[PDB]
Write a structure and sequence with these properties.
Chain B: GO terms for molecular function: chloramphenicol O-acetyltransferase activity. Chain B: Homotrimer. Chain B: It holds the Pfam family CAT. Chain B: Belongs to the chloramphenicol acetyltransferase family. 3 copies of one chain form a homotrimer. Chain A is of the alpha+beta class. Chain A has one domain: Chloramphenicol Acetyltransferase, CATH 3.30.559.10. Chain A has 5 helices and 11 strands. In chain A, strands 2, 5, 6, 7, 9, 10 and 11 form a 7-stranded mixed β-sheet that branches. Chain A has a 3-stranded antiparallel β-sheet with strand order 1-4-3, with no helix packed on it. In chain A, a hairpin with a 4-residue loop joins strand 5 and strand 6. The first copy, chain A, is globular and about 50 Å long. Chains A and C meet through helix 1, strand 2, strand 8 and helix 5 of A and strand 5 and strand 8 of C. Strand 8 of chain A pairs antiparallel with strand 2 of chain B, so a sheet runs across the interface.
Chain lengths: 213, 216, 213
């Protein structure tokens, strides 16, 4: 876990971070209906599992702009060199769930081998965290039941909670498209509308143009 | 008067025991989600028998809270408990003052029994401007009428969430989409007692209850 | 800033206010897909810059119902004589934003002159609040990258936070209509479901009715 440090005093967000860090503190959530038609044909074509393919493109995005990798570390604003995805896994028998993370790598195929290995070893372990947590994770939850038009998280304690949370809903047909509900909660000290915005646009674009692989 | 009973939850035997303690302490969150419920069949039924929509719908919601224990937790005298029943507390709008009140009606399995109660309640209290014109009891779940708008989101950020385990639903304005009529419907739940699967199953089962409802 | 103090004891919402200040306190967010079809045909056939014209309608509505103008001032609930819009101005070069406010005026043209001054004079200023914060503002945040189906503000600290917060998303075509996501956060001590829906209903009316002057 390497990191580097933000120089708040030279930062064009100095004022925003100080305000969202003490008085105007807030988190905010956004839901979008993603067009997954092309993503889903690629995944089907490649016989990829959907969930890891999708955790993957989300992870690449968190590993493409530093505003999604902040943390407070021993009192300084820091940026992890990487963040690793931490996604939920459902247990049918007990009707409960676990959160597992898998080491991130640009190459989807290399992350896919890590991912299916972790699920193979840990998918039946009923701890809330079969393999512990690490400091530098982002969260992905599947909510496959509901085609929500809104999903929003209200965390009792948001101090330094900078790790982005995504919630993917249940996709559905609309005319020619397959659409999928996607929400992303982020903390306002470390992310503006622009950032979540650029992210979401890059997501829609990557989803359309990734060719499996 | 009815006092209801309850059963203490044996936490050390609970599959969710680890979740429970995380969501009571550190991961403590609440969350909201909104769906556009398709109420085409439901609506047709209501129109045709001659029901008020609002209590038909409350009655559906209350049958789901009273079919799954995950929706009827509280902390009572320092302990997680499941109530044997929960009763709906719904809102009622007063035109002349533009305020609202929160009323509760005793639940029952039979729509007719339920309707007769709701009606008595809305006749004796519909006009009372108190906030809780019949006080409040220890086991209710909430339903908000929000008929002004066809929202694509609705959601409650309660400031004080500690043991606030009682589900809150919010009903928006139904509206046309091609063939269908759809109603915005929103639920907040507390993560300590309800995971995604429970809300998701609940909503899936709502869509069914709406569709298969015979009207009594 | 003039204001009126509320006689709590003769207020029809005395008990709700008391409950929403104290244990039940809560905030609540709604989003609607505003039909801007007519509005947009007018901003266009005319002189018009979209944002300002839209900020002006929301300021008409804030300045028509006292419930959008309350505040806790020195221990007492008060209603401002007026509230002035505090809107976002984006800065491409540093990918940051500021909040500016402008004096509200009833006539659209006078407001547009004030807006343009404020934007010209302060839009390149990298301060978070280039003109400071005054005590009677409501917020309007443009979020132009995302046709959200939901936007939700979760303020860590909702004591006396009574100023409404609007957020505009990106508008889109559907059928013969052009829609624009609009969310509103308010605090329940001062706004119940009726006031937000009345206002959203009148927002829709005014967008369809707007004449361009």
């Amino acid at each position: 876990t390497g990191y580097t440090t933000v120089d708040i005093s030279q930062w064009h967000r100095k004022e925003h971070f100080e305000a969202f860090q003490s008085v105007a503190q807030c988190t905010y959530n956004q839901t979008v209906q993603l067009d997954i038609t092309a993503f889903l044909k690629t995944v089907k074509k490649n016989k990829h599992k959907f969930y890891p393919a999708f955790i993957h493109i989300l992870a690449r995005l968190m590993n493409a702009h530093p505003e999604f990798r902040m943390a407070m570390k021993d009192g300084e604003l820091v940026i992890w060199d990487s963040v690793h995805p931490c996604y939920t896994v459902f247990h049918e028998q007990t009707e409960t769930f676990s959160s597992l993370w898998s080491e991130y790598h640009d190459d989807f195929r290399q992350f896919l081998h890590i991912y299916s290995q972790d699920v193979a070893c840990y998918g039946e372990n009923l701890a809330y965290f079969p393999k512990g947590f690490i400091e530098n994770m982002f969260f992905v939850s599947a909510n496959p039941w509901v085609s929500f038009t809104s999903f929003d998280l209200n965390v009792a304690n948001m101090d330094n909670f900078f790790a982005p949370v995504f919630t993917m809903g249940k996709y559905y047909t609309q005319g020619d498209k397959v659409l999928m509900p996607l929400a992303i909660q982020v903390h306002h000290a470390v992310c503006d509308g622009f950032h979540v915005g650029r992210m979401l646009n890059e997501l829609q674009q990557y989803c359309d143009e990734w060719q499996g692989g």
